[PDB]
Amino acid sequence: MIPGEYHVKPGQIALNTGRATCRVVVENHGDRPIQVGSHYHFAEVNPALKFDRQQAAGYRLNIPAGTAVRFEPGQKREVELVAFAGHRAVFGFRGEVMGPL
Amino acid sequence: SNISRQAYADMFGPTVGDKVRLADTELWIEVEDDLTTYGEEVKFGGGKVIRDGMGQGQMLAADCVDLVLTNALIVDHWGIVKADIGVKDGRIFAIGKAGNPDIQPNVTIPIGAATEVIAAEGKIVTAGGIDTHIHWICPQQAEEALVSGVTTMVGGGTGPAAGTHATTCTPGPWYISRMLQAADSLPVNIGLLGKGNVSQPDALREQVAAGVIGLKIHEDWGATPAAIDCALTVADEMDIQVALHSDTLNESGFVEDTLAAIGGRTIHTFHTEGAGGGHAPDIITACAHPNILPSSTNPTLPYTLNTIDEHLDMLMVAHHLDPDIAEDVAFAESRIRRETIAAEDVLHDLGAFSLTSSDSQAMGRVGEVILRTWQVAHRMKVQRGALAEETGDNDNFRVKRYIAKYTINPALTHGIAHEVGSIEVGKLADLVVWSPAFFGVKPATVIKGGMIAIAPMGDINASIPTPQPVHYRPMFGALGSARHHCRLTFLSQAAAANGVAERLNLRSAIAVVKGCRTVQKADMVHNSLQPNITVDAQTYEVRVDGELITSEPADVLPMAQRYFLF
Amino acid sequence: SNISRQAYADMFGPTVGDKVRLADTELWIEVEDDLTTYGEEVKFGGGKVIRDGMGQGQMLAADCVDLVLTNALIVDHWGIVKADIGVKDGRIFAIGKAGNPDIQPNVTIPIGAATEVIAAEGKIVTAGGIDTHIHWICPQQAEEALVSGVTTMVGGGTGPAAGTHATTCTPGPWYISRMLQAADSLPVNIGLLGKGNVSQPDALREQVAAGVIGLKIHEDWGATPAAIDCALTVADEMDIQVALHSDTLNESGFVEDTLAAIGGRTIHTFHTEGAGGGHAPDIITACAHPNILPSSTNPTLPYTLNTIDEHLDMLMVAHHLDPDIAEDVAFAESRIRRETIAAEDVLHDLGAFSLTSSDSQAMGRVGEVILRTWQVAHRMKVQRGALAEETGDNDNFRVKRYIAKYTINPALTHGIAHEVGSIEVGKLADLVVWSPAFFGVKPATVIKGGMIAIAPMGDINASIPTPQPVHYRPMFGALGSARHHCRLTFLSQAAAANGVAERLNLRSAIAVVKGCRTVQKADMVHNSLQPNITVDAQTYEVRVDGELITSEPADVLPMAQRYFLF
Amino acid sequence: SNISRQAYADMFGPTVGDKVRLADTELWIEVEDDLTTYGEEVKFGGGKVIRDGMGQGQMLAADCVDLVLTNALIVDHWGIVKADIGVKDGRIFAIGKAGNPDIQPNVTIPIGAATEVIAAEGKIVTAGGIDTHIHWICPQQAEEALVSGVTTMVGGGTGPAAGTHATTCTPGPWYISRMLQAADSLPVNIGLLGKGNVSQPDALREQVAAGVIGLKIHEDWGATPAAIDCALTVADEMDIQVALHSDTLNESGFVEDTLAAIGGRTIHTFHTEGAGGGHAPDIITACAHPNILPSSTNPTLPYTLNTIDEHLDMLMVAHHLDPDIAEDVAFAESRIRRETIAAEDVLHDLGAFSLTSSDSQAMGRVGEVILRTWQVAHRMKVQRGALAEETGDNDNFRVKRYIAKYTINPALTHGIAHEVGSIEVGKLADLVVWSPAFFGVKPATVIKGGMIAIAPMGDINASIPTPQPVHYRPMFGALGSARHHCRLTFLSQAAAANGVAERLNLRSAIAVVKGCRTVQKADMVHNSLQPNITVDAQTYEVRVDGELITSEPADVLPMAQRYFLF
Amino acid sequence: MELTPREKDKLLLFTAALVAERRLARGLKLNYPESVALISAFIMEGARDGKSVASLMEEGRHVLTREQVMEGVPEMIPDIQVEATFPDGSKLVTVHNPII
Amino acid sequence: MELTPREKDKLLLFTAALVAERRLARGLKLNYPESVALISAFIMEGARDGKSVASLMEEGRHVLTREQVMEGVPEMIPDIQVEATFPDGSKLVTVHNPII
Ligand code: NI
Ligand code: NI
Ligand code: NI
Ligand code: NI
Ligand code: NI
Ligand code: NI
């Protein structure tokens, strides 16, 4: 007996199903580490990360909500992106879109 | 991508199909539904989801909620579901999916710059409890009840006076006015009960016009057929509730005479089992009638090994009885019956008894209404197994039936369900957040009208709020004007119209009671059973349809020694 | 039928001829009269008398009392009698026989649906005490005094500042206004004293116009003939009282010079014995004059074995004196005299000293005014036997003489006797209920303006109010608006007319002082003796009509180690 | 006549040339000037100077001060001098020579009948502290801070909610209104910060119009260039301050990008060293810019042997990070650097960092802002010796530089210096009295708006205020209406004009912020250094003009184990 | 710990009993508050041990005798009442005439 | 003494630990609040002695074992945190999984 214990049924949860995704190779050209959150508009991340910003337009990291991907200086890796939903309007970040798309 | 169910539960709390143990009891609840879109759950913290342009939108205050409880496991009479809860203007705005509509799908609860966040992942959220049997013996009772998870207190009293020690009555206009004024200082919603023991209607109308939301008929002030009829006549014309503590002595008649005096009119019977007061030994037979809304006080819940032993002296002090006077001790003993005490637990499990209350400091424990209600559910599962209504391998239905006993049912009985009693849109945001391991025992957060009013708090000078010693301390929602804005003082329709709030210069929000005469047993959520119940005059045995109703006393109970320092 | 006297006492408390021991002292009181009709006593509880149609009538609120204290043994300056006490609108309605005129005879206090009940059978009820020597050093003093049974506090101060540490003065309009506002937060009736040490009348009139009900002349601010004359001149024109702490140093003159400066005008002399301040060593000779209302502060009451030893260092800290400065220590010593300390007790027993007070945290104990007054009575009975005025085999007269010292006499001296000071119809219902075994030490209930303000309270979560730990806790009468309605802020007639209450937005009830200039020694109830008293300049011996006045120091006192944890 | 210097110091406190040790540190202050006339010092007590016609005059209230602090040793940013302090109408009237002009020379602070006295001889008096980094997690923080000597608290929060646990934000109009109302109940001056993380200006303007005096940009809500620009644009038009907690993750850019986004606009950078949050690992380089007002939170002050060890878990709980999530632990570690922690102390000693704050219960200790500031000064004197600016054999300049960090500089940064922040005529009388042996640790008296609000208080029932147990208790200045009159609620100019105080029915005095956009680094008193500072991306080494900046961790600190029970 | 108001209230009783305990140990005759605190604290520990209400109602009358307390004290305490968390929840223990 | 609110708050923790200490001595298996109070009070004294934060983070995991506490208690306490005045000022001690 453990007070308030969970009895989680085994299996897996499929995240962000039925949505467009794309893979991109990213490389940190900066001298300091960069960490990106799950819902940040990838196309507007720190300018030191080199990748096809055009392909990442309207996309975010396809990872469980609240988690992140870290890039140490000089680190190169391929990430999977998932398209934004809702109104597909981007406001904030580096202020590059500030509107629909 | 993909994530395992266990890892998922650790991050966002359980989802559909997962089961959770309630505290250290044998009760397990299973998540029935989850209103989220997997991958779009909102989470707050460093580098999380709720951030500008991401999980937080660009809308003005008018278009977003003031507060959001993220990933909450709701336990209410209507369901056990996983969802985000939005609170706006001190009231429940919506139960759904929170976030930013600009980039997220299915958002029903918009989060903006004006939104505060309470992380409920891994926690259970319930409506605040409602105790309708309060003896206002001391103001300290309000903090004790609030800490237990009770946010509304209905009762009567003027302080530690003999009349209040024994009865839930705030006698007359002067005392009523005084107590309504004092109520502004307390962090719980309050409604008062006047002394209904009189055979002159005008003496009752004055009290209702002064502010009481109900009338208490108590045997200590004379629970005679004439007084009962008078109170009910006034209740019928002023839309207020009557609470009854019948004639234990059978002085004016037996239970059948009292029932006849009531004449099919709506009435709330306090401690229907009898130990707390009532026709000896059959007051319990009242739960068979359609116009009776029956409740239990808590010292007899549940039946345990030490229950009987502690009752005699408790009875005496509560009613100013003299142990040297033979007649006083004989009538105290006729109220304590193992037979009816054991049956009461079963009647609750069957839904024949619809409410639980305390009877604070007058044969009841103010901080143990919720705790004892769950102990009964546990003892009943252990003894009787699954209820006929259960579906699936969980105790979901029994949990819904029991939570209704101290939330929605007391609200319906007293005509305040339009304001509080459950987690439904439009109702006051009185919410209680619990960690599964401490469910029903010690809350993580108690929210009153949209503001946290009390919570466990560690070292004030510490670098974080968690270091020891951690104990309950009043928060901003319990302070001065913020408190007034987050609590309600319930008045009768007559008092409201008479301008009582303006005259007494009451500072808190005002709410009016209504629908006290139209509620009947059939309206009690999950507890509408009207059994063909009988009590043997000689043996005191309780039978329903001829079958003997009984249970065994517990030697050890959950939610007890594992949690309390004393 | 018939009932034995012992059984009767156990049920309704003592009656005519029965004697009761006050706490653990040697003082016994005998019931002088009983206003009941045997067989018609009202009692509340399960199956008792106060029930609909029986001991409770059918009258509207306007025709019955709000509260009744049943079977109370009243101890007041006018008598020691058994009776029911009716309270209506926060004031004493009647002292007589309570019940229902419909079926009971001789009912003078009608009980109806609007009536709350406090069971006083077996208890002693007295008026709330009045301490007129308060140093407002900290607000916590109010709760300490209330718990001891003191309901009115008159004094001055602004908090823990040097000026307040030494004197009872709230200096000027700004501080006076601030303290009047802060007073609304305290559960006791309050009146303030301004700084009367000035030789410019207008500087005094401003303070009176701002709200003070009196002026304190203190040697620390210069108790010179000029300042004294100025204060008395203003007092005479504004109907306020002057409290004096004379020139101990004999710097401006001797006691005869101060008396000459007073010029037969009414004045209240604080700590007339001298230890607390005053012309060394003969300030005590002031009690011989008709215009002097003399009081004692409590550390010298009564004379005990440890009295002298504790005084030197107490004196120093209270007056900011330097023990390294020879002149400072010499003047501290000239104030402590075994001779005058011993005589003071006797002078109280004779009625030459008319009041007792504390001198809170400035050479006095705020929670020990009542307690010490009774210890003096005990020590005096033990040493001097019965007073010449005693009749019967009891200490009734000595009890009436001493209770007057902290109730009616302080009220008369400060012009507030029309509102408080005794249990008489029309006066504010400030009452204290005591159990005989704890009389004068720890009250059972303290009532302020008709509402219980503080009382001993057990476990808040318990099934009854009696389980341990039992300690004093604030009740509804001490809460927010209810408190404002149950307490009084006393103002000068000038302040009242100037609209000070409206300007400062004071929330509590307002009362005005009057009759401060017309009271004289002859008006002090049971304490109007003007003895031909002399003090030997060299030996400090006190003599009345040539006879030496003295007493012996106690080694052990009642109302001490048997009741306190520390 | 003549008196020796030692005897003089014992009676009136030290004078010109005398040195005093601050608590148990190695810091010594030397009295620079004395505004008295030898022989004419005012002293209160039995037979002292402040008496009618002597040190006290005949003037009306309008022509004398309400309160005088006699013989005080003032320690402020402008000087360390001996003088009397006059307070009138709750504000600082004058710093000079008190007394009666009728018989004394050079009197600039007249004492009359309306004057209260606080004896400050032998005590140090300072302005009340100002903490601009408060997380309103619980109301109890106000008493803790007040007791430490902090009288003004600026921050944000709604209680123990996740958003407030991590950020100093009171989200939106509803919560802002609620917190402004609750503020009336607290004994400290209060100003609120709203959530500035939005890219829609109107959502920010609403919050300012509702009452916040600043906007907090926090990375937990998204510290992106767009959000930063938006907040600064609104700040520029509404004259409010912006507090920043930058993007530690370097997610939107590096420190140079954030600085570019700021674009030379005024901004207050919280915990500029970085442990509390900010671009890893070079946020500290912000102190080089003219538009940046840099502060430190207190857990890293000063660098000690146990500093690093306690930080990791503290970081996690404060930001809702998951220790099982690798990325969460990696970003927590990148914030804790021995290199920047050691450099921070030196930068404070050099005046590159201008303020100290707490970061209450979210990586900071509310009662240790003052205490830790002095510990840094001590450790810096011990390690680096005298500052280049020192004159004479004392630490006067270092003391002035450090006291400015928690008094005048925070006031200037937040636009409230016209009301509080220093002991200057016209400013609110928020003063703290200290005994040299307890300087910076435990105050003797805390004055709010001219009234003592909290102080150590002994046995309430004692004959004097000094007997044990002595602990901090609320005084009259912290009570009801007196409190409202002695505290300030700061509002934005827009809120003030919109009638927010009238609408919410705020009871306390209102003050408006102004001058938040025009302050720059050069305006920080004694702390205006803009060093050419660099941080090595790999080694984290901090260098100024190429030279390595560092210090050694303390094993033992003053103002620690000698004073605290736990 | 998450101590509720009632748990903190009982800490006051426990501490009051420590005072009495030390004084009884010195050989002093206990006064009114000391006696009430000592017997009360005894019952609370009994409940923690798992003793029944019935057993404690009896055992409580054997903690202090008339010779260990001051004169008049036994008569000032007609009964003692205290509640504690028994294995089966909170229960009330009433000890009549505890001192004899 | 001039006790600040935080010093008085810690007196509550110390007293709670005295209760637990006496019960452990009787041979009882400690419950949730008793366990938290005992380990916490242990750390506070460690700081008074002058032990480092690092040492206490370790020592704190050896005050109570799984066999000295009630079932479920070890799981109800994933960690314990308390602050005390070390020779170098106030520091936070976090003990992960104190009971094993
Ligand atoms: Ni009842
Ligand atoms: Ni009841
Ligand atoms: Ni005096
Ligand atoms: Ni005095
Ligand atoms: Ni921060
Ligand atoms: Ni912060």
PDB file of N, CA and C in Angstrom, chain B residues 143-144 304-307 309-310 313 365 368 372 442 468-472 555-557 560-561 563-566, chain E residues 1-8 10-11 14 47-48 52-53 57 83-88 90-92 94 96:
ATOM      1  N   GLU B 143     -11.325  28.804  10.386  1.00  0.00           N
ATOM      2  CA  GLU B 143     -10.002  28.470   9.865  1.00  0.00           C
ATOM      3  C   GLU B 143      -9.798  26.959   9.849  1.00  0.00           C
ATOM      4  N   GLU B 144     -10.292  26.288  10.887  1.00  0.00           N
ATOM      5  CA  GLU B 144     -10.178  24.837  10.997  1.00  0.00           C
ATOM      6  C   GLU B 144     -10.908  24.171   9.824  1.00  0.00           C
ATOM      7  N   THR B 304     -16.855   2.599  14.698  1.00  0.00           N
ATOM      8  CA  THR B 304     -15.568   2.022  15.096  1.00  0.00           C
ATOM      9  C   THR B 304     -15.619   1.460  16.518  1.00  0.00           C
ATOM     10  N   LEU B 305     -14.532   0.813  16.928  1.00  0.00           N
ATOM     11  CA  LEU B 305     -14.433   0.210  18.255  1.00  0.00           C
ATOM     12  C   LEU B 305     -14.565   1.161  19.451  1.00  0.00           C
ATOM     13  N   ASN B 306     -14.170   2.418  19.279  1.00  0.00           N
ATOM     14  CA  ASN B 306     -14.228   3.400  20.366  1.00  0.00           C
ATOM     15  C   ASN B 306     -15.421   4.350  20.318  1.00  0.00           C
ATOM     16  N   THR B 307     -16.252   4.219  19.289  1.00  0.00           N
ATOM     17  CA  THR B 307     -17.418   5.082  19.101  1.00  0.00           C
ATOM     18  C   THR B 307     -18.374   5.190  20.286  1.00  0.00           C
ATOM     19  N   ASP B 309     -18.109   4.210  23.536  1.00  0.00           N
ATOM     20  CA  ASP B 309     -17.451   4.659  24.759  1.00  0.00           C
ATOM     21  C   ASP B 309     -17.314   6.171  24.948  1.00  0.00           C
ATOM     22  N   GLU B 310     -17.002   6.882  23.873  1.00  0.00           N
ATOM     23  CA  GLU B 310     -16.824   8.327  23.942  1.00  0.00           C
ATOM     24  C   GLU B 310     -18.106   9.148  23.923  1.00  0.00           C
ATOM     25  N   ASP B 313     -20.401  10.974  27.801  1.00  0.00           N
ATOM     26  CA  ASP B 313     -19.949  12.237  28.382  1.00  0.00           C
ATOM     27  C   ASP B 313     -19.997  13.394  27.390  1.00  0.00           C
ATOM     28  N   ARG B 365     -17.071  17.167  14.994  1.00  0.00           N
ATOM     29  CA  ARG B 365     -15.736  17.704  14.763  1.00  0.00           C
ATOM     30  C   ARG B 365     -15.649  18.510  13.467  1.00  0.00           C
ATOM     31  N   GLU B 368     -13.404  17.509  10.493  1.00  0.00           N
ATOM     32  CA  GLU B 368     -13.463  16.123  10.028  1.00  0.00           C
ATOM     33  C   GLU B 368     -14.664  15.661   9.193  1.00  0.00           C
ATOM     34  N   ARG B 372     -14.063  11.993   7.486  1.00  0.00           N
ATOM     35  CA  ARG B 372     -14.941  10.921   7.944  1.00  0.00           C
ATOM     36  C   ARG B 372     -15.844  10.373   6.842  1.00  0.00           C
ATOM     37  N   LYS B 442      -5.300  16.586   4.045  1.00  0.00           N
ATOM     38  CA  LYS B 442      -4.586  17.856   4.082  1.00  0.00           C
ATOM     39  C   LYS B 442      -4.449  18.379   2.655  1.00  0.00           C
ATOM     40  N   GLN B 468      10.984  23.385   5.783  1.00  0.00           N
ATOM     41  CA  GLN B 468      10.263  23.243   7.038  1.00  0.00           C
ATOM     42  C   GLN B 468      10.489  24.439   7.975  1.00  0.00           C
ATOM     43  N   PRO B 469       9.551  24.699   8.901  1.00  0.00           N
ATOM     44  CA  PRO B 469       8.318  23.948   9.128  1.00  0.00           C
ATOM     45  C   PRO B 469       7.202  24.384   8.181  1.00  0.00           C
ATOM     46  N   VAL B 470       6.501  23.407   7.626  1.00  0.00           N
ATOM     47  CA  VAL B 470       5.400  23.681   6.718  1.00  0.00           C
ATOM     48  C   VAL B 470       4.091  23.471   7.459  1.00  0.00           C
ATOM     49  N   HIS B 471       3.306  24.537   7.578  1.00  0.00           N
ATOM     50  CA  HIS B 471       2.004  24.465   8.221  1.00  0.00           C
ATOM     51  C   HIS B 471       1.056  25.467   7.572  1.00  0.00           C
ATOM     52  N   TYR B 472      -0.241  25.275   7.767  1.00  0.00           N
ATOM     53  CA  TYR B 472      -1.231  26.160   7.162  1.00  0.00           C
ATOM     54  C   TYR B 472      -1.223  27.595   7.666  1.00  0.00           C
ATOM     55  N   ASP B 555     -11.401  -1.324  13.716  1.00  0.00           N
ATOM     56  CA  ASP B 555     -10.384  -1.259  14.759  1.00  0.00           C
ATOM     57  C   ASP B 555      -9.318  -0.237  14.351  1.00  0.00           C
ATOM     58  N   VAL B 556      -9.117  -0.100  13.042  1.00  0.00           N
ATOM     59  CA  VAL B 556      -8.149   0.837  12.471  1.00  0.00           C
ATOM     60  C   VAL B 556      -8.784   1.462  11.224  1.00  0.00           C
ATOM     61  N   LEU B 557      -8.531   2.748  11.006  1.00  0.00           N
ATOM     62  CA  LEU B 557      -9.082   3.469   9.859  1.00  0.00           C
ATOM     63  C   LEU B 557      -8.000   4.186   9.055  1.00  0.00           C
ATOM     64  N   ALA B 560      -5.916   8.465   9.242  1.00  0.00           N
ATOM     65  CA  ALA B 560      -5.816   8.644  10.682  1.00  0.00           C
ATOM     66  C   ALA B 560      -4.368   8.823  11.169  1.00  0.00           C
ATOM     67  N   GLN B 561      -3.826   7.839  11.883  1.00  0.00           N
ATOM     68  CA  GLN B 561      -2.475   7.956  12.442  1.00  0.00           C
ATOM     69  C   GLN B 561      -1.279   8.176  11.513  1.00  0.00           C
ATOM     70  N   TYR B 563      -1.152  10.448   9.184  1.00  0.00           N
ATOM     71  CA  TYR B 563      -1.090  11.866   8.828  1.00  0.00           C
ATOM     72  C   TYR B 563      -1.021  12.901   9.939  1.00  0.00           C
ATOM     73  N   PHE B 564      -1.550  12.576  11.111  1.00  0.00           N
ATOM     74  CA  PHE B 564      -1.585  13.534  12.207  1.00  0.00           C
ATOM     75  C   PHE B 564      -0.522  13.401  13.293  1.00  0.00           C
ATOM     76  N   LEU B 565      -0.002  14.550  13.719  1.00  0.00           N
ATOM     77  CA  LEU B 565       1.034  14.617  14.741  1.00  0.00           C
ATOM     78  C   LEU B 565       0.485  14.274  16.122  1.00  0.00           C
ATOM     79  N   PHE B 566      -0.807  14.511  16.318  1.00  0.00           N
ATOM     80  CA  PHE B 566      -1.463  14.222  17.587  1.00  0.00           C
ATOM     81  C   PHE B 566      -2.813  13.559  17.347  1.00  0.00           C
TER      82      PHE B 566
ATOM     83  N   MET E   1       5.352  18.842   6.705  1.00  0.00           N
ATOM     84  CA  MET E   1       4.492  18.326   7.806  1.00  0.00           C
ATOM     85  C   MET E   1       3.031  18.675   7.577  1.00  0.00           C
ATOM     86  N   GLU E   2       2.791  19.853   7.001  1.00  0.00           N
ATOM     87  CA  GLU E   2       1.442  20.373   6.733  1.00  0.00           C
ATOM     88  C   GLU E   2       0.594  20.360   7.992  1.00  0.00           C
ATOM     89  N   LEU E   3       1.116  20.948   9.066  1.00  0.00           N
ATOM     90  CA  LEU E   3       0.395  20.980  10.334  1.00  0.00           C
ATOM     91  C   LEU E   3      -0.836  21.874  10.291  1.00  0.00           C
ATOM     92  N   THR E   4      -1.971  21.288  10.659  1.00  0.00           N
ATOM     93  CA  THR E   4      -3.262  21.970  10.720  1.00  0.00           C
ATOM     94  C   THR E   4      -3.300  22.763  12.033  1.00  0.00           C
ATOM     95  N   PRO E   5      -4.280  23.674  12.188  1.00  0.00           N
ATOM     96  CA  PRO E   5      -4.361  24.452  13.430  1.00  0.00           C
ATOM     97  C   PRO E   5      -4.461  23.564  14.680  1.00  0.00           C
ATOM     98  N   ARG E   6      -5.239  22.486  14.607  1.00  0.00           N
ATOM     99  CA  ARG E   6      -5.401  21.586  15.751  1.00  0.00           C
ATOM    100  C   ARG E   6      -4.124  20.859  16.176  1.00  0.00           C
ATOM    101  N   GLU E   7      -3.250  20.549  15.220  1.00  0.00           N
ATOM    102  CA  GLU E   7      -1.995  19.871  15.531  1.00  0.00           C
ATOM    103  C   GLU E   7      -1.079  20.850  16.241  1.00  0.00           C
ATOM    104  N   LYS E   8      -1.084  22.096  15.778  1.00  0.00           N
ATOM    105  CA  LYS E   8      -0.264  23.131  16.388  1.00  0.00           C
ATOM    106  C   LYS E   8      -0.786  23.472  17.780  1.00  0.00           C
ATOM    107  N   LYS E  10      -2.206  21.347  19.859  1.00  0.00           N
ATOM    108  CA  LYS E  10      -1.783  20.256  20.726  1.00  0.00           C
ATOM    109  C   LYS E  10      -0.306  20.368  21.114  1.00  0.00           C
ATOM    110  N   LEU E  11       0.496  21.059  20.299  1.00  0.00           N
ATOM    111  CA  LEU E  11       1.915  21.252  20.609  1.00  0.00           C
ATOM    112  C   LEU E  11       2.037  22.125  21.854  1.00  0.00           C
ATOM    113  N   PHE E  14       1.396  19.747  24.820  1.00  0.00           N
ATOM    114  CA  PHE E  14       2.582  18.912  25.000  1.00  0.00           C
ATOM    115  C   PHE E  14       3.671  19.679  25.751  1.00  0.00           C
ATOM    116  N   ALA E  47      -3.208   7.207  23.265  1.00  0.00           N
ATOM    117  CA  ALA E  47      -3.902   7.059  21.992  1.00  0.00           C
ATOM    118  C   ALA E  47      -2.901   6.752  20.868  1.00  0.00           C
ATOM    119  N   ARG E  48      -1.742   7.409  20.897  1.00  0.00           N
ATOM    120  CA  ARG E  48      -0.710   7.182  19.885  1.00  0.00           C
ATOM    121  C   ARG E  48      -0.224   5.731  19.963  1.00  0.00           C
ATOM    122  N   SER E  52      -7.216   1.716  23.970  1.00  0.00           N
ATOM    123  CA  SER E  52      -8.628   2.015  23.756  1.00  0.00           C
ATOM    124  C   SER E  52      -9.083   3.189  24.617  1.00  0.00           C
ATOM    125  N   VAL E  53     -10.205   3.800  24.246  1.00  0.00           N
ATOM    126  CA  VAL E  53     -10.759   4.904  25.025  1.00  0.00           C
ATOM    127  C   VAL E  53     -11.096   4.406  26.439  1.00  0.00           C
ATOM    128  N   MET E  57      -9.693   5.924  30.026  1.00  0.00           N
ATOM    129  CA  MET E  57     -10.627   6.534  30.979  1.00  0.00           C
ATOM    130  C   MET E  57     -10.301   6.066  32.398  1.00  0.00           C
ATOM    131  N   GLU E  83      -8.803  14.984  23.293  1.00  0.00           N
ATOM    132  CA  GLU E  83      -9.004  14.159  22.113  1.00  0.00           C
ATOM    133  C   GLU E  83      -7.660  13.933  21.454  1.00  0.00           C
ATOM    134  N   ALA E  84      -7.533  12.800  20.783  1.00  0.00           N
ATOM    135  CA  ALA E  84      -6.302  12.454  20.099  1.00  0.00           C
ATOM    136  C   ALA E  84      -6.634  11.502  18.967  1.00  0.00           C
ATOM    137  N   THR E  85      -5.703  11.337  18.041  1.00  0.00           N
ATOM    138  CA  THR E  85      -5.912  10.431  16.934  1.00  0.00           C
ATOM    139  C   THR E  85      -5.602   8.990  17.330  1.00  0.00           C
ATOM    140  N   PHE E  86      -6.663   8.218  17.527  1.00  0.00           N
ATOM    141  CA  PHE E  86      -6.535   6.805  17.860  1.00  0.00           C
ATOM    142  C   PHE E  86      -6.380   6.070  16.517  1.00  0.00           C
ATOM    143  N   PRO E  87      -6.085   4.762  16.545  1.00  0.00           N
ATOM    144  CA  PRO E  87      -5.943   4.050  15.269  1.00  0.00           C
ATOM    145  C   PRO E  87      -7.227   4.139  14.442  1.00  0.00           C
ATOM    146  N   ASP E  88      -8.352   4.298  15.133  1.00  0.00           N
ATOM    147  CA  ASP E  88      -9.651   4.411  14.490  1.00  0.00           C
ATOM    148  C   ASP E  88     -10.176   5.851  14.428  1.00  0.00           C
ATOM    149  N   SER E  90     -10.131  10.220  15.504  1.00  0.00           N
ATOM    150  CA  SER E  90     -10.236  11.061  16.686  1.00  0.00           C
ATOM    151  C   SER E  90     -11.326  10.583  17.629  1.00  0.00           C
ATOM    152  N   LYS E  91     -10.985  10.483  18.911  1.00  0.00           N
ATOM    153  CA  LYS E  91     -11.931  10.056  19.936  1.00  0.00           C
ATOM    154  C   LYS E  91     -11.707  10.924  21.169  1.00  0.00           C
ATOM    155  N   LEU E  92     -12.758  11.064  21.970  1.00  0.00           N
ATOM    156  CA  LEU E  92     -12.741  11.857  23.190  1.00  0.00           C
ATOM    157  C   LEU E  92     -12.572  10.976  24.423  1.00  0.00           C
ATOM    158  N   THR E  94     -12.693  11.022  28.460  1.00  0.00           N
ATOM    159  CA  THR E  94     -13.137  11.784  29.614  1.00  0.00           C
ATOM    160  C   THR E  94     -12.744  10.994  30.851  1.00  0.00           C
ATOM    161  N   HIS E  96     -13.009  10.990  34.779  1.00  0.00           N
ATOM    162  CA  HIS E  96     -13.709  11.582  35.914  1.00  0.00           C
ATOM    163  C   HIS E  96     -12.870  11.484  37.170  1.00  0.00           C
TER     164      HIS E  96
END
